[PDB]
């Protein structure tokens, strides 16, 4: 839980001023005003849609969820209203596979990649009982969304240091790309799909393109193979005074 | 060119004899395996400008010191000469998949290579790191078939052992 | 073309080790600096002595003394003089035995005990 | 994940067998020596903060170029991330010694670890050396042959737990090599 | 690397804007306060051996208990690693006076230091006593200029605050 | 990102050296004519609305099969996304002219761009011509040799500032080549 | 030079018999495994330069007197010849694995190698110790249990080609004894 | 060894003749030149541990990438073999000033070196950067005399041109 990259080599996460405006008697929030309000909206449009670069006549159908975001200043409600939009399902649901849609919900709304096939198959168990809005509100009303973001900050891609699987950091680095990438370049097909269902891992150059500036992006590659052999049993022995003991 | 055809002809031309039954028996193996290595070749031919971009970034990822002032990737006109020389090597692997042997890699890529890269202070370990990255970024049913990847990754293993 | 300092050292290595004591290892010589490290692992002459195996349970407390009577000097105050970009340092680590001196010592000072 | 009793019933599920009295005599001795498995893992978690810092700084001792400019334990930023990582490795092999099966070390900690290290730039030969110091200091606490810190046990052999945990530390080297 | 330039365009990129007419004023303050923080930096570069020899034994004159068995400076490479770690810190103080912000300190010296020094039993109060010795060793007409002592004794007690 | 002062710091930290008296004559001569860096980044972003419009409209007049059906900037949703891509390219160049170093141009713009312009079918041989039109227009604003918009300056030269920004447009012009 | 087909004809020519019957049915099953042999020669030629530099380095780490002044692998002229002497042995074993008969190994490489090495002053103890390392590498590559690289094959068993390649490498060590 | 004596003896042995008047005239050049090249060989043999270690870390001051994983300066053994292999080369230059030709450098350092530094993947431009640093470190009146430094540098860039 130290995480040497997070507030050092990246920026600080954006969001509303505090969470004490909810308990105020005569306001709803420290009111930003329309110069420090709309530049928070620029970071929700950049995070939920990828870098999709929505036009003026595509932003004109999100006027109702913005106008509510400047009254209730809840960030979880703005993200929930933008994921049930037509502009979220015409980019990430319409021309994609099912595990491509699921792996972008972990990117746009959690800042991590899915850790398992069992965690991924339960997201398709919620598709059968309520469609795509049952997937979206179960991510948003989870415990993992509460104790990292709350109503206060935008859901950003967080370098934690103490990931519950090491593979979770790998799929986070493939999903989040470099700056000036987007989520439409692969033609519908899921990047992480072979590695979730088999249990293998990712490619080192695809992860190190997305690391921040100052992290030795790519060195350490020996010129032999990049993954491990599960069938190999090596002999690793330790020297004692007399000989060498192979505690295998 | 080292091939299946030019090996059995030169073995019979040096002995002064006609093509016998064993010399025709080996051209039959050029028919039973032409299918696998030719759809490994047209897969590489149609998707070559995306592979040599991904491969040539793997040498400037591990050996990032080459863009320092003084080294072989010092300015801009020397960086695209590295991407040119990697596109040369991927084009010659396409020729060895067409011919059926290591001929176009021997005669055009390997012979005289170590004398050139030593005289011009080019590290041969970074003409390798772009090639060894292409060899392990190869999935078995996705990029090509099963036996098309065995052929394709054998001319990459040939170039790795020849530069080392 | 021998010398007096060389022949006074080697003549202590002709007694038996039940007699000569520390002088039984007086035939060993000074090697290059890289010979004392990890593939080769050549032994210095100080490691055959009982000074190399000194580890008492007692200790000086250093808060008994008056303030001003404990002195501390470094070897350098410079970071790339104490440890370079390579790991070849005279001061920090396991590479301080890689030096051109100190393969041999003076055990002809005292006695054959 | 699995433990030592769950590993037996997934072997019998491939043949649709019943776990009977032939197969149960390995599990009847896992509970018979089961006091000593607990008695060995609080010999490790009672000394775990000394064990990590000795293993990481003992790797700096045999390799002083890790703390020069250009080493990957150079600043405070990189050295605290190395100290965090050796505590994570020692945590997952104490779970695996407690269960009696190296499943949870192999899928959560070790799966995909080799690709993190060749993207961040972590040297893996010296990282194996920090694990191999803390392998050697883990068999000393279990067999009670450590030079300081004698703990109070009962008498007998724990020589099969000391080589079971030495094989869990050997899987970390085999997965990042 | 928090500088003056690397904050006004990390806010110009966070809203997707051009270099504003606000941010062309923030580099006009980089022209004014440079000549007190460059002249404080160049004084530290030609005097650094003498200021870290004096700062390091302010730890050991104060704390004689550190040579006890098991403490921080118990042998001679630990004394050599103590004077290294105060040679590193005032090198970063020299770096912060060049780029004008606290960027090189909190990226290379401060981040991690709560977690590193706790695990290795290195006391924070001995690190503070070396740096707080040379904060009031500064003599404002003698050593450097009047405002040059303000810049040099701003990064010093930034480090005394963040360590404590 | 690193600016022009923090580049000199990360070169000297590789040597573990203090920034002496020899490097400070390149940083006192950065801030000596450092008015002119502010006095010429202002004369890109004042004309930067017209500069992106004349860039891509001259990209049409030399490759007129872009507006043919099948061409990349055929319809209205693609002509708008081509217009904002010249905005983002011009934005991260004007950061790098303010910073003195191409660190914020290469990490936040050029990393992975040719990788994805082949993945969307953007013809990069005519996207280079999009950059190099506004390269020519920016270096005559700084030189004050434009036909219209004679912006009043102070007398001297910005011949080195005109060529530092021409190196920045050749960094993007070589990245997507 | 005999292959595996020339051996069963020489054996049949001694009694003047036509090849047919039971030894024609033993030959039809030799070619049924003919793709496993072709799959496995490729798994050694592909890794042939790392197999040699690891076996020569591993002979040196066991006996560091070969790189001392006066050692046999001391100078650069003699280091390059041991790296050449050691890959000719691997090259001639790959001929015998492809042919399925050790005749070409025994007469073009092994006949007189012991008298050659004890005439040049080459230690035959260390040459055996490098050949036995290359044996352990070739059985690991054929059975696909290398810890450094896993290849792609069809599923099945190739433990008879590992028993055969170990017999060729044992014969190299017994010949230069 | 290639020397002045062994050249004129081998030339008069292949011709099958006695030492002529021109073969004795060459050994007189070995007399008038021995004063300069034995001063350099004695200056080097007294201060060799400080010349080798000053040039051994001039490799890693130019190429800090050698401490990355998989490289040639990873661990303690690999830098012990690196400072050894530089000390081997400086011993052979001491042997070449004594003999008088490029004999010991050719047979013991250069022949077979291209095939070893490529098989073991040691970057040959880093066995050069230590040799090129010593050639420019030499002050021509300070360490040796004028003609002793001409002989010392001429054997130092023979080794550079043989690795390049
Ligand atoms: C980046 C990958 C490398 C690097 C590469 C460079 N290679 C350079 C030149 C070069 N390459 C070849 C071989 C190539 N040319 C061919 O005709 C064929 C086969 C048909 C092949 C494989 C040659 C012959 C040359 C020299 C002539 C030339 O310039 O093309 C090169 C230019 C060197 C120079 O101009 O001085 C570079 C920069 N360099 C790097 O930084 C990493 C190691
Ligand atoms: C914390 C101090 C524990 C403790 C741990 C043990 N360490 C044991 C062995 C050991 N420690 C080191 C590192 C040490 N040696 C060095 O050369 C340097 C500096 C460069 C350091 C810090 C090494 C290398 C080893 C040996 C491992 C090996 O041989 O590869 C150990 C084993 C038995 C013993 O020596 O006691 C233990 C138990 N010891 C303690 O009592 C406290 C609780
Ligand atoms: C080998 C590691 C030791 C050693 C071990 C033995 N321990 C034996 C018994 C034992 N240990 C504990 C405490 C343990 N059991 C628990 O349930 C918990 C925590 C909840 C802990 C820490 C107990 C209770 C016992 C049983 C004896 C008793 O109740 O007093 C033991 C006896 C064999 C057995 O009964 O299993 C051995 C040999 N003794 C040694 O000499 C080495 C160093
Ligand atoms: C080359 C990089 C190949 C590769 C070859 C393999 N080597 C295997 C085992 C092995 N290697 C050595 C030498 C090594 N050990 C040392 O102690 C030293 C230095 C002192 C060195 C250089 C030995 C002694 C052995 C083991 C012999 C035995 O088992 O008795 C091996 C086996 C399996 C595996 O490691 O996966 C292979 C395949 N390994 C690679 O990954 C690349 C492709
Ligand atoms: C124009 C006819 C009025 C007037 C309008 C203003 N409304 C402002 C904010 C606002 N309006 C609504 C209602 C509408 N927006 C919705 O999203 C929905 C439901 C889907 C409805 C019916 C809401 C909820 C809000 C608050 C959200 C927001 O802050 O924009 C408004 C701005 C005030 C402000 O910024 O606080 C104006 C000026 N006001 C007028 O004077 C004329 C008569
Ligand atoms: C295989 C066991 C894995 C797997 C790996 C993935 N590869 C991905 C993309 C990709 N791979 C290549 C190289 C390969 N394809 C080719 O066409 C050729 C040459 C003819 C080669 C060597 C390329 C060029 C690309 C990028 C193009 C694309 O978008 O597909 C990939 C997607 C993520 C990424 O690497 O960008 C994966 C996941 N895929 C699997 O399902 C199994 C598990
Ligand atoms: C401490 C209160 C003294 C003091 C002692 C030093 N002694 C040094 C070396 C040394 N001491 C002995 C005698 C010791 N060895 C024995 O076998 C017996 C009795 C059976 C005794 C009392 C010997 C033989 C040696 C030399 C052997 C060796 O060096 O290992 C010593 C080291 C000096 C040096 O080598 O520079 C010290 C400092 N010195 C003091 O100042 C107080 C008075
Ligand atoms: C120390 C013994 C090593 C070393 C370690 C470094 N690790 C760095 C980052 C890092 N490490 C891990 C793996 C760790 N985290 C986990 O969650 C798990 C499994 C549950 C493990 C094993 C991750 C995932 C990361 C990146 C995440 C993050 O830190 O934010 C690191 C920092 C590199 C940098 O600053 O660029 C270091 C230095 N490095 C060494 O040299 C020794 C050998
Ligand atoms: C002197 C005032 C101290 C003292 C210090 C010791 N520090 C030890 C190690 C150390 N110091 C640092 C921070 C330093 N390294 C850097 O790279 C930078 C910035 C670029 C800084 C400020 C680190 C990270 C470390 C640990 C790693 C190492 O050995 O280099 C140290 C040795 C630790 C140990 O004993 O195991 C000591 C003794 N000693 C004192 O008595 C006062 C408190
Ligand atoms: C001449 C260019 C300059 C000058 C240069 C300095 N050299 C300094 C130290 C120094 N130089 C050498 C190399 C030289 N001495 C040798 O013995 C040999 C070969 C046998 C060579 C090539 C060495 C080894 C050293 C370090 C030992 C020492 O002299 O203290 C020097 C002092 C600073 C430094 O440590 O480099 C300077 C200033 N000196 C001059 O006066 C003229 C102008
Ligand atoms: C920060 C880095 C960064 C950039 C540099 C740009 C790069 C960029 N451009 C486009 C997207 C595009 N880019 C172009 C551009 C061009 N086509 C042409 O004919 C011209 C040659 C050229 C510029 C005039 C076009 C036409 C599209 C639209 C393609 C589409 O609609 O699918 C996309 C995909 C966005 C999406 O729709 O999801 C991205 C990431 N955006 C970024 O985020
Ligand atoms: C096919 C159709 C077609 C066009 C749309 C124009 C587009 C166009 N304009 C200019 C050329 C220019 N563009 C500008 C920029 C501007 N000029 C002003 O008066 C404003 C202040 C500012 C924004 C409009 C300037 C100043 C030049 C002249 C060259 C220069 O001085 O840099 C160039 C030359 C760039 C080059 O040589 O590479 C081109 C192609 N020309 C064409 O052939
Ligand atoms: C907040 C916003 C902000 C700015 C816009 C600039 C504004 C600005 N520019 C200059 C000053 C100047 N500007 C120029 C530049 C030029 N003269 C020419 O004829 C060339 C065409 C052109 C080159 C690009 C020169 C030559 C000077 C004076 C010399 C100098 O100090 O650099 C000066 C100093 C006053 C002077 O020297 O006259 C100022 C305040 N500074 C700021 O702080
Ligand atoms: C000219 C180039 C050329 C080659 C490289 C080989 C390539 C090759 N290998 C096999 C086929 C095979 N190869 C293996 C070999 C192995 N499987 C293992 O599990 C072991 C690790 C390893 C060595 C024992 C096995 C078991 C088969 C299955 C068929 C068989 O048993 O013969 C096949 C047939 C199956 C298929 O079509 O996919 C082919 C073509 N043949 C050629 O003609």
UniProtKB/TrEMBL annotation, chains B, E, H:
Keywords: Antenna complex, Bile pigment, Chloroplast, Chromophore, Electron transport, Membrane, Photosynthesis, Phycobilisome, Plastid, Thylakoid, Transport. (2R,3E)-phycocyanobilin binds at residue 82. Its main location: plastid. InterPro entries: Globin-like_sf (IPR009050), Phycobilisome_asu/bsu (IPR012128), Phycobilisome_asu/bsu_sf (IPR038719). It is found in: Plastid, Chloroplast thylakoid membrane. It is a peripheral membrane protein. Signal peptide: none annotated. CDD domains: PE_alpha. GO terms for cellular component: chloroplast thylakoid membrane; phycobilisome. It comes from the Eukaryota. It holds the Pfam family Phycobilisome. Belongs to the phycobiliprotein family. This is Phycoerythrin alpha subunit. The gene is peA.
């Amino acid at each position: 839980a130290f995480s040497s990259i997070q507030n050092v080599l990246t920026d600080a996460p954006l969001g509303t001023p505090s969470a004490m405006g909810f308990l105020d008697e005569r306001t709803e929030k420290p009111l930003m005003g329309p110069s420090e309000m709309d530049e928070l909206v620029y970071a929700v449009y950049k995070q939920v849609f990828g870098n999709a670069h929505i036009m003026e006549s595509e932003r004109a159908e999100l006027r109702d969820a913005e106008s509510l975001f400047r009254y209730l200043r809840d960030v979880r409600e703005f993200v929930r209203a933008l994921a049930k939009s037509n502009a979220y399902t015409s980019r990430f649901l319409q021309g994609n596979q099912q595990y491509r849609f699921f792996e972008l919900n972990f990117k746009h709304l959690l800042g991590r990649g899915p850790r398992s096939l069992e965690e991924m198959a339960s997201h398709s168990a919620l598709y059968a009982e309520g469609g795509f809005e049952a997937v979206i509100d179960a991510i948003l009303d989870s415990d993992e969304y509460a104790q990292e973001f709350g109503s206060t900050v935008v859901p950003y891609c967080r370098f934690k240091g103490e990931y519950p699987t090491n593979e979770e950091f790998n799929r986070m680095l493939v999903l989040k790309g470099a700056n000036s990438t987007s989520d439409k370049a692969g033609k519908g097909r899921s990047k992480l799909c072979y590695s979730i269902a088999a249990g293998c891992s990712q490619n080192w150059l695809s992860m190190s393109k997305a690391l921040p500036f100052g992290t030795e992006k790519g060195t350490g590659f020996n010129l032999i193979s990049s993954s491990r052999n599960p069938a190999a049993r090596p002999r690793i022995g330790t020297k004692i005074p007399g000989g060498v003991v192979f505690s295998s | 060119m080292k091939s299946v055809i030019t090996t059995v002809v030169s073995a019979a031309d040096a002995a002064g004899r006609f093509p016998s039954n064993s010399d025709l028996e080996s051209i039959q193996g050029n028919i039973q395996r032409s299918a696998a290595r030719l759809e490994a070749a047209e897969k590489l031919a149609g998707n070559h400008e995306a592979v040599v971009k991904e491969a040539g970034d793997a040498c400037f990822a591990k050996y990032a010191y080459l863009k320092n002032p003084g080294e072989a990737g010092e300015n801009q006109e020397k960086i695209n000469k590295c991407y040119r020389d990697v596109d040369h090597y991927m084009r010659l692997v396409n020729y060895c998949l067409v011919v059926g042997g290591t001929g176009p890699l021997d005669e055009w890529g390997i012979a005289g290579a170590r004398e050139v890269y030593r005289t011009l202070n080019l590290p041969t370990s970074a003409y390798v790191a772009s090639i060894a990255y292409t060899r392990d970024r190869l999935c078995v049913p996705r990029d090509m078939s099963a036996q098309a990847g065995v052929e394709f990754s054998a001319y990459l293993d040939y170039l790795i052992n020849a530069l080392s | 073309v021998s010398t007096t300092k060389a022949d006074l050292r080697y003549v202590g290595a002709t007694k038996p080790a039940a007699v000569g004591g520390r002088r039984a290892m007086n035939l060993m010589k000074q090697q290059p600096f890289w010979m004392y490290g990890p593939p080769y692992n050549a032994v210095t002459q100080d490691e055959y002595e009982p000074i190399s195996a000194a580890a008492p349970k007692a200790f000086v407390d250093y808060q008994i003394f008056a303030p001003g009577t404990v002195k501390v000097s470094p070897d350098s105050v410079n970071a790339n003089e104490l440890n370079p970009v390579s790991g070849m340092s005279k001061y920090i680590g396991k590479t301080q035995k890689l030096v051109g001196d100190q393969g041999i010592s003076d055990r002809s000072d005292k006695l054959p005990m | 994940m699995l433990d030592a009793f769950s590993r037996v019933v997934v072997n019998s599920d491939a043949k649709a067998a019943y776990v009977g009295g032939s197969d149960l005599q390995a599990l009847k001795s896992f509970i018979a020596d089961g006091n000593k498995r607990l008695d060995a893992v609080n010999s490790i978690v009672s000394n775990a903060s000394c064990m990590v810092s000795d293993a990481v700084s003992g790797m700096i001792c045999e390799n002083p170029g890790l703390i020069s400019p250009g080493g990957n334990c150079y600043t405070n930023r990189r050295m605290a991330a190395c100290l965090r990582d050796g505590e994570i490795i020692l945590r997952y092999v104490s779970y695996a010694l407690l269960a009696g099966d190296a499943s949870v070390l192999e899928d959560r900690c070790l799966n995909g670890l080799k690709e993190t290290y060749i993207a961040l730039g972590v040297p893996t030969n010296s990282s194996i050396r920090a694990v191999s110091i803390m392998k050697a200091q883990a068999v000393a606490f279990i067999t009670n042959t450590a030079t300081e810190r004698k703990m109070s046990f009962a008498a007998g052999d724990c020589t099969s737990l000391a080589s079971e945990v030495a094989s869990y530390f050997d899987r970390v080297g085999a997965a990042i090599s």
